[PDB]
Every structure is written in C-alpha cells, then in structure tokens.
Amino acid sequence: VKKRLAVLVGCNYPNTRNELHGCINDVLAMKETILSRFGFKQDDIEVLTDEPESKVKPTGANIKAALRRMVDKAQAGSGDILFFHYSGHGTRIPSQDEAIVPCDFNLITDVDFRELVNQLPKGTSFTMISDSAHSGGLIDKEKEQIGPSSVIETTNKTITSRALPFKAVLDHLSSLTGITTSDIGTHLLELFGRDAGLKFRLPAMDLMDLLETMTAREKHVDSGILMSGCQADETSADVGVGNGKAYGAYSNAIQRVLNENEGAMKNKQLVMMARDVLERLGFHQHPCLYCSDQNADATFLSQP
C-alpha cells in the first residue's frame, strides 16, 4: 500500500497590483492529470488557491503546513509518492537565494524547501514543479541534472512575468511594519513570527549549524526532485491566449508533453521535452531539473 499525496498551490493575487491570470488554471489542469493518469485520489490532494471565494488561502503558513503534513506521512521503504505544484510569483533575494511568494508575501525560500525534503526517508520521492520566476535552485544544494552547468522568433503570445522584484516585495512588507530597514528578514519576523522562513527567524550561528546538518543528511538520503519553470536568473511566463483561458507556459508545456507521450517517462525526459516544447514555441525560459542521479532516471511520479 503506497501513498500518493499532493499539494497544489496557485496564486493569481487577483485584484491587486501583482495580478496573474493563469496560475489557478495550472492547478486545475494538473489536478485532473494526477487524478486520471497517475492514480491520485481526491482526498489525498490539498488545493490552496487565492480566488476570492476560496476556503483555504495560499498563505505562507498554510502552504508550509500542508507540505509538512505530507512529508511527515512518508514512510521509510514504502515508496510513497509526494507531489507539490506551485504556480505564482517568484523572487530572488540578493546576497543568491530563491523564493516563492505566497499570497500574503510570507516568503518561502530554498532553505525552507531543503528542510522540508530532509524530513523524507529513503525510498520515497518528493516531486516539486514550480512554475514561477527564479525557480531553478528552489531546493537548496540539490544537484543540478538539467540546467546551465549540465546542458527562433519570440512567441507571439501575450505574456506576463511571474517575477516580483525584491524591491517590490520589500516595499510591500515595509508598508505593513513601518520599519525603514532594508533587511527583509526583520519585516518578515515582525509580521509572521514563528511562521516566517527559516532564513529570517534563526540567529546567524544557528542557521550555519542547520546548513551543515542539512548538508550532512544529503549524503545519506536524497528524495527531492525539483522541476523548475526556469533558471535561477530567469522568469517564467504567464500566457494569455486571447479568449480568457490563461496558463503558465511551463505548466502548459508539461501538459503538452504528457498529452503526446502516454507511456512512462523518466524525470529527465519530461524536463528535456518540456524544454524543447518551450524553445520551439519561442519562450525564452529554460526549465531545469534538480535531483539525484538515480531519481533523474526514475519515472515521473512513479507511473506504472
């Protein structure tokens, strides 16, 4: 008895200055895919989207809580399959760290995702697809399998960047605290307390030891699989078709690859084919893959 668990997050930030249009559609499309093709069950899928009528908003605390509940349920030797999809804004913190932007701006950074996957026992898998800017590297120190160190007219589509500049994020938070410091950690700790990211709540000395501790475990267990929408220094495109059916370019490329290839695919094959789709379609972003050598050759979501 193997578990198939999913957390699907989409942030459109609707009726705000940072609105996106395709992120919730990405969640709904991927939900239908894992239900039909990959054998996931409805009650094993948590959906967090920020449409105004939503019951559970994708705040930083709600996302981290849903991910923590999943990773704690994986059992050693079980082969449990855990899946996390994110569509929304991404940002980069200078001197670099990558982050996703929950709807309340309680940033979740690459060290938070490293701490999360370090809870997993050997034999289980955590597959993360992050259709967001600066998403390459979102699992700190996870080995790059496809990316700049290991591997056509521009699209005519209407596109919107899924990046929020760091200055925009810092200004939004400073508006809430009234503090004039440029240290984003100070704002996040004041606003979110223990729900703030690891980088911002721990003292400098304690963060160093935790980094060494997390580095130590990676030599024994490596269960994390990151499929990013773009490189660390890139953005990911939100696509407007022209009829009201927006989508993330990368999430849609994944759908196209899956539609053309019903058989089981290795993780590296899915990413390589998604890159080819986006390149052919004139998008500039380059999806990347971070995982162990063994998981690069493993089947995506352990499809039969």
Domains of the chain: 4-302 (3.40.50.12660)
Which pair of structure tokens corresponds to residue 121? 């026992």
The DSSP element (H or E) to which 192 belongs, if any, is: helix 184-192
Q: Around Cβ 211, how many Cβ atoms within 10 Å?
A: 17
Cβ atoms of residues 165 and 260 within 8 Å: no
User: C-alpha distances in angstroms, 170 versus 17, 109, 199, 204?
Assistant: 15, 15, 15, 21
Residue from 277, 188, 284 nearest 236 by CA: 284
Please tell me the distance from the alpha carbon of residue 222 to that of residue 296, in angstroms, as a whole number: 12
Residue 87 corresponds to which amino acid? S
Q: Indicate if the alpha-carbon torsion angle 201, 204, 209, 212 is positive or negative.
A: positive
Residue 64 corresponds to which amino acid? K
Q: Mutual orientation of helices 110-117 and 204-218 as an angle, nearest 10°?
A: 50
Please tell me the distance from the alpha carbon of residue 250 to that of residue 30, in angstroms, as a whole number: 12
Angle at 211 between CA 104 and CA 147, to 5 degrees: 75
Which pair of structure tokens corresponds to residue 261? 């290839």
Please state the φ and ψ torsions of residue 290, each to the nearest 5 degrees: -130, 120
Cβ atoms of residues 296 and 268 within 8 Å: yes
Residue from 271, 172, 286, 289 nearest 237 by CA: 286
Please tell me the distance from the alpha carbon of residue 136 to that of residue 99, in angstroms, as a whole number: 10
Task: Starting at the earlier edge strand, list the strands of the sheet with 237-240.
Answer: 158-161, 237-240, 247-248
Q: Provide the 3-class DSSP secondary structure of residue 150.
A: coil
Kindly give, in sequence order, each residue whose CB lies less than 8 Å from that of residue 81, ignoring residues fewer than 6 positions away. 2, 3, 4, 5, 124, 125, 127, 301, 302
Buried b (16+ CB within 10 A) or exposed e, 196-208: bbbbbbbeeeeee
DSSP code per residue over 27-63: HHHHHHHHHHTS---GGGEEEEE--TT-SS---HHHH
Alpha helices (H) in 41-109, listed in sequence order = 60-73
Number of alpha carbons in the 13 Å side-chain half-sphere of residue 187: 20
Which pair of structure tokens corresponds to residue 149? 């160190």
Q: Provide the 3-class DSSP secondary structure of residue 246.
A: coil
Kindly give, in sequence order, each residue whose CB lies less than 8 Å from that of residue 270, ignoring residues fewer than 6 positions away. 227, 254, 257, 258, 300
Angle at 56 between CA 12 and CA 22, to 5 degrees: 20
Rg (CA), the chain: 18
Please tell me the distance from the alpha carbon of residue 62 to that of residue 82, in angstroms, as a whole number: 17
Widest CA span in the chain: 55
Q: Provide the 3-class DSSP secondary structure of residue 103.
A: coil
Q: Provide the 3-class DSSP secondary structure of residue 163.
A: strand
| Paired sense of beta strands 81-87 and 4-10, if any | parallel
Secondary structure letter of residue 44 according to DSSP: G
Which contacts of 182-189 are long-range, i.e. CB under 8 A and separated by 24 or more positions? Answer: 184/93, 184/107, 188/106, 188/107
User: C-alpha distances in angstroms, 70 versus 8, 18, 46, 127, 158?
Assistant: 12, 29, 10, 12, 36
| CA 263 remoteness from chain centre | 25
Cβ atoms of residues 140 and 113 within 8 Å: yes
Please state the φ and ψ torsions of residue 175, each to the nearest 5 degrees: -65, -30
| CA 82 remoteness from chain centre | 13
Q: Resolution in angstroms, to 1 decimal, for this deposition?
A: 2.0
Residue from 65, 273, 285 nearest 161 by CA: 285
Please tell me the distance from the alpha carbon of residue 101 to that of residue 285, in angstroms, as a whole number: 19
